[PDB]
Each structure stands twice: as C-alpha cells, then as structure tokens.
Amino acid sequence: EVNSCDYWRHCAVDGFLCSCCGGTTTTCPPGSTPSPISWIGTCHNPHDGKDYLISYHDCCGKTACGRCQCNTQTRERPGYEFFLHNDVNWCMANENSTFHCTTSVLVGLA
Amino acid sequence: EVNSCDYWRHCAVDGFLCSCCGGTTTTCPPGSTPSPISWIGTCHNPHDGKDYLISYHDCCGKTACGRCQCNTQTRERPGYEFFLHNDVNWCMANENSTFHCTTSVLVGLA
Amino acid sequence: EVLTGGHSVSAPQENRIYVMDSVFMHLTESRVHVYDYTNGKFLGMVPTAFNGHVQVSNDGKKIYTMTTYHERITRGKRSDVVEVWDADKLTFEKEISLPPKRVQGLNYDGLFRQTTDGKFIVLQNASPATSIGIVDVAKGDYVEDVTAAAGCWSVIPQPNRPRSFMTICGDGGLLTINLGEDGKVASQSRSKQMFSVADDPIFIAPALDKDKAHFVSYYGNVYSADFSGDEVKVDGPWSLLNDEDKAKNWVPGGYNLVGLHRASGRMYVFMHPDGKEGTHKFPAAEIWVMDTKTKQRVARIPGRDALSMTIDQQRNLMLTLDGGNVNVYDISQPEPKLLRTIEGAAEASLQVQFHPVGGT
Amino acid sequence: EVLTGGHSVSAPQENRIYVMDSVFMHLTESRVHVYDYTNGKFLGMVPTAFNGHVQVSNDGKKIYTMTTYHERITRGKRSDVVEVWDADKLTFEKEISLPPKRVQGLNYDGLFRQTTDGKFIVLQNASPATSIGIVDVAKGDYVEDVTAAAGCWSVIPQPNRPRSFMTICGDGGLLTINLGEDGKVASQSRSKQMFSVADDPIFIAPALDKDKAHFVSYYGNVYSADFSGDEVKVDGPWSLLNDEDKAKNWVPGGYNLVGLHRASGRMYVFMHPDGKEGTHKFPAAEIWVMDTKTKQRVARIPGRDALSMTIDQQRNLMLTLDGGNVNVYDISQPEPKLLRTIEGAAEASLQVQFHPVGG
Ligand SMILES: NCc1ccccc1
Ligand SMILES: NCc1ccccc1
Structure with missing residues (x-):
C-alpha cells in the first residue's frame, strides 16, 4: 504494498x-484533519x-509529510473538470489549509 | 575563490x-538586512x-538562501564564550530574525 | 569594512528570470529565485510562504506575489494576500487583502495574471466553487469577485484589449470578461463549444498570440480561439501528428507545456511517445516546433525531460524547466539552439518567467 | 469507506523516539519526526516553524516545543512561544508566551530542558545577553527570568533534586539554581573553577548521572561536577587518551556528543583521529566507551559518522545520529551492538530523544 505509488x-x-506518514490509506495521521472535499479517481482493480x-x-493542518510522494494521473483532468483535478490543494477549504498527506478512500464501483 | 568554504x-x-546569494562578502543580498551583532573569527591569511x-x-529577514553552505569552525568556541560561537543565529536581535545568509567582514589585524 | 544593505539587483532587468520554487517538500517556504539567464548567476529571491504564485508587472517595475499566511502557520486565522515588491530592491512594499479562497495549487501561468494595461491583477479563486478575483493594483483593493466564471478555470488575458480576459469552462467553451475602468465586470460573452471535455480535453496553457490563442489536447490536437473580432470564434481540431507519430503514440505532456513565438507563428510543445491514459504530465522526450499557419512540424529536438516553458518575444528566446534546471534556447530560427543550462535553479519549480522588456 | 481523524499514535510510548529536524535549508519549516525505534516506522510529526526545539514531558504525557513566529514570517510582529502538545494525539493544546529572546540555534539538549519533577520548563534566552527562562507548565506562564545566569550557557538538570539545574559560566565554573515551588529562584550557588575556558574548553553536552555530570574537552580531557551535596564539587582533568591515542591526535567531536549509562558508569563519546583546531564538530570515526570509575577506555566501535546521541537507561539503548540517519544500539553490555539503522529520519537533525518511560 500500500506504500507504493503503484498500488492500484x-x-x-x-x-x-498517508500510510507512510503515521496514518493509513483511510485515516489521517495523528493531529492532521481530513478534508471534507476531494478529487476523485477512477482506478482499475487488477485483482477483481x-x-x-x-x-x-487530503489530511491538513500539518506541514508536508515528505514520504512516499506520488504523482499519478490516471483519468485526471484539468481544473475545468474541477473534482477530477489533482494539481490543487484539496485542503483549500479546511480550517488550516497546510497540506500534510493524501488518503485514497474507496467510494464504490465506478 | 570567494564562493568556496575554504576561502581564508x-x-x-x-x-x-552571501556572495552566492546575490550579495557579496560584505553586502547583503537585495532586501535582506544586516545584523548589528555577530560572532567573530580569527582567520589566517595565507597570502600575507x-x-x-x-x-x-548575518543577513536577515528573508528565508534560507540555500547556496554555498559552510560549517567551518576554526577557533570557534561554545556559548559560554558567546561571541566566538557559531551555532546560534546572529540574526536573533533583528527586526526579523529569519536567517538568509552569512557575510565575512574584515575588522582588522588580530 | 562595513556590512551594508539596501542594494539593488546586480544585473540589469533585461537579464533577469524568475523561477517560482514551490519547494513542495516544504511548501510553507516557497520562494521566487531570481537568476541572470545570460550567465546562470543567482541574483536574489522573494519569500512567498505557503504555495506562492508570482508574476512581474507588465511595466517591469514590480513583482507581484500571491500567498497564504496563518497566524501560527498550521493554525490560526488565514490571510490570503497579493504582495507588491520592488523589482530592483526585492523589498516588500504593500499587502492587498484577498478573501480566503485564492487558488492553492501548482504554478500554471493562468492562475495569476494581469490585464494587458497592467491596471488589474486577475487571479483564480476556489472555495472550492470557482470565481475570478480582480485586484486594483494602484488602489490596493480587491474590486470584485467574478462569480459568472463558476465552473470555469484559469485566466487568459486578451493582448489586443486593455482589460479583457478569457477563461475555459466546463462546457468546452470560453467565457470572455470585459472590465470597466473601476475593475468591475462591464460585459461578458460565451463562445460556442471549442472542444469536447470528455473526448478531447485540452491542456489549459495557451499558446497566446496578440489576437488569438491556441490550445493542445491530451491526444495531440490543436484548437484555436480567435478574439480579433467582436466575439470569440473557435475552431479545431487539427492534429500535431503524422502517421508515423500516431503509430508511436506521441502526445503532449507537461504543465506550462506550450508557447508561441508571435512574429513567426511558431508554436512550441512538449511531447513524449507511448502516450496513454495517465501520461499527460510526463516529462518531454522532445520539443516539437509547429508552424501554426501551415499546420506542419518544422523542428523536433530533445526535450531534456522538461515540463514547463516560457517564451520571450522581444529577444526570441525559450526557457524550459524540468523541475530543477532551466535550459535557455535561441528560437530566432525554426530549429531551437540550446545556449546553456542553469543547474539547481530550484528544488521543485513548474514555472519560469522572464522579466518583461518592452511589450507595449 | 470513510476518512477519519482524531487517531492516536499507533505504537506504544515506550517504542517512540523524537528526531528534531531543523530542516536548515528551509528552517522556517522545522519539525519533530516521531519514529518507532523497534522497527523504523514513521509514527507522526509535530510542526515547529522557525528553528524549533523539542522535549517530551518527564511523565510522558505531553510534548513541549519552543519556536518563533512572525505575523508574516519574514516581517511583522514576533512571537516566541512554548507549545504544549498531547503526546498520543500529536495535537496542539496550549501556547505559552515568552519574551522575544528565546535562543535561536542548533539543537543541543541543554537549550530546552525541564526540572526533574516536570513542573517547570527551563530554557535558554539570548538577546544576545543571556539568561534562563522558567515556564510554569500547569499555569501556562513564563514566571521567572534568571539574570544571575548572564554570561553562562545551557541548562543541566540535577536528577537528584526536584527543581534544580546548573549552567556553565564564562569563569569556567558552574552556577546552580534551585527553584521554589512557584518557579522563582529559591537559592543559588557558584562552584569553584572547573576548567580553563581558554586552555581546555569543554563541550557543553553533559554525560549526566543521577548525582554528577561529566564533560569532555576539545583536547580529550574529562571534567566532573558532583552534586550529591548542595555545593557542587568540581574536578578534572583526566584524559580520555592513552599514549597510542595521542600519537594519532584522537579528540572528541560532535554536538550532543556524549552519554552516560548510569547503572555501569560507562561514558560514550564520539571521537576522531587527526584532531586539530577546527575539528570539534567533526563526525565520529569511532565511539569510545569509557569506564568513569577506572578512568580508562573499555571498548571502541565504528562511529558511522555520527554527530549526536542519546541514551535510554531502562532499556539499555543508545541512539546515534549522523544528520539524517538514526542508529539503534544495545548497550546492555560494554560493547555496543548495532540493531538497526533508520534511514532518512531527517534532512538536518542534530538531536534525537527517547520517549520517557521512568515517570
Ligand atoms: N493533493 C495534491 C496537492 C496537494 C497540495 C498542493 C497541490 C497539490
Ligand atoms: N549560524 C546561523 C544559524 C541560523 C539559525 C540557526 C542556527 C544557526
């Protein structure tokens, strides 16, 4: 693996x-706050x-974790399709917008 | 020659x-402020x-220059000989204490 | 000897470039690095706190930054600001307060721009609802919030009008905003659909001429918006690609990935082979040079893993940037010529800009 | 799935260490990185703005940081503060205002300490005039400014008294301050001269026992301050060096460069050969293990270019740190055994500390 950028x-x-930052794929590291908003990806699960x-x-309100940096862009689109776009800080609307790390929360089947 | 840490x-x-940071050996880079206080070194000039x-x-009030980092320690002493000590920020009493770069100002013969 | 401050930048304005270092690993200490492009000399810097953006005033006198502070950085009250800095002294002059929704994101040119006449700064907001903010520089005021641009993104100034700009909208068209002398919206218009958002998304970076703008797509097509007349006329696609190119799956990639040399109509574009879903921000394997009149490629050269570029019309130059190093090219002829590389200009930069010369 | 916050550190307190990353290249974004020393796992972090300092409360419940803010970072009004953070949630709880003279400098332990009883934080000021500041943790207030410590530097707590500490002064002696239960100075005393400031300067880092402290010098001598009584008794020098060692010019070097294993009296010191003027902060070629009772070396091992160390008494552990990587040693026997290295624990750290377990 979950700590690899290649994890599906x-x-x-x-x-x-965040899993490299004292958190997990679905939990913020201690003392960092979840964003209520996010960008969305459509990802292929090679297992099923x-x-x-x-x-x-994003998890917010702490400075950059610095570990396990990824820049993957599958199905990512520019800011005119705003919620598919990942070159913006999805912490932008939090009480503190400082960006700490990113979680990958499974919503459901596409 | 002056941009080397082994310049005398x-x-x-x-x-x-500071000479790597848009200033010179005796001038602060634009928009950074000289410290009124300093640590003092006694250095041998091998040319004379x-x-x-x-x-x-130090030059102060801008964030770290990042260029030509040196950590040379000739005749440097701990904080109980305070003005010979270089592990403290000599911008500490400036209007803004953020450390930008260090100058090497010739005072005179030792 | 005596240590002095108060000094000006050592090289003349026409030698200066601005490398916007996000310092993503330590994003609260982003800064602008000022370099002499003629010899690679570091000239100075401007601190820009969390995820700074930067531009130079059209008249070349001031540096504008946009940033976010909090009272205690990671806690406390937020202040989003534009700052005005003196270009020659690299000193802070004025803060202009913004509402706490200025865009936080990577440094595309179109997120922080100015009207052609230089009177207004035009910036992108996201709360996450999008709107365009207008700042009156002289007055030091935030003049209005263009909520008409909801669902659109980025600012493309029209260089043939004093206070007009366009934005790219989710309908695949362009919204044009014309400001009054006070900076408030005087009129607006929407173009017909230029591109399919679903089937042929465009990169936001324009290849900007005086009276038209070209855009490249994820699949290597080119679209145009012509604003020489009363309203914007749109067209495209035409393909950057020949058969051989298509067989090797060449497509564009990068961030500020295109440029236009206005006198010749040459468009510069970062390209890479083996394109597929997810490669649109890949480093350049090559730079292609297109003649926008003939719609033919006139040169291709190694890309040096570049991601962003900028063009100087007045000296016929192109800079490219791979995140850390700046390459300087002479583009006075169809094939660009590499002059030098400035190594270690930034830790994490996706934007470089020239200090303006002339341009009236 | 739903994203949640509010979580606690995933490993027990007894596994945790604190790597103070100055991030000197971007010193306004210094931070503390929290690691599990048993497996190298990153557990979390605390942001510490410009040139932060850190310690953990002696009872293990809180993390204390010391830092400087300005309203606009590089301009605007200055605020020097101590912050109290919860140790398990890694969340901010309280800001304590300091006068705008807290020490800005590299992370020697002795710049930011606490009384043995944990009730007071004891910190070094420099304006550049020096004094020691006292913070009452419970009250959340700066309560005392020890101007008697002018011309002295750093804070060495006495582990055998609840609210006493020493500082090293420009006369080559020690000033001892005993605080009252209000955090105000209750008494003080000054030792006789322990070392020659000019001729044999000591490193400020103590090798601290329950009732005495040892110091090493630029030339490899050892001095001691015995505080088993109210008056501190000083002695030294004895040399770290035998004749063979002297032939190759071995001397100490580093920052937080010494440690003491209290049960055995073993003192650990970073050393390098070919010492001369200007090498006192060189990385370790070796760690030497000294018997402080017999005043002789017992062991020597490779130094792994380490600069700073810390000791855990109860688990018999030593950590060393080269700026970026943390080495974990078992020191239950006279020869340290290397257990693991945590790579990339920091970009620019000169200080690592264990979570306290002693209560
Ligand atoms: N979620 C990606 C990101 C975070 C902060 C700033 C820019 C982009
Ligand atoms: N000696 C310059 C410096 C700046 C900040 C902290 C420590 C040292």
Missing part, C-alpha cells in the same frame, strides 16, 4: 501517501478486474 | 555565503601570512 487505489494521487471510484481526501 | 576569511562560517579578525554578520 493510488492511481490519481498527487501528494504523499473492476473499476472503482476513489476519493482522494 | 570564511574560517568560522556556519551558514550560506597574517591573522585577521573577521566579523560574521
């Missing part, structure tokens, strides 16, 4: 994997062969 | 040489064979 769920992560919607919520 | 007058620099007192003023 991480197909549109631009950031640091199905595509899934993944919500990339 | 840089014998007690802990910091970034004499020892000189060098005053290591």
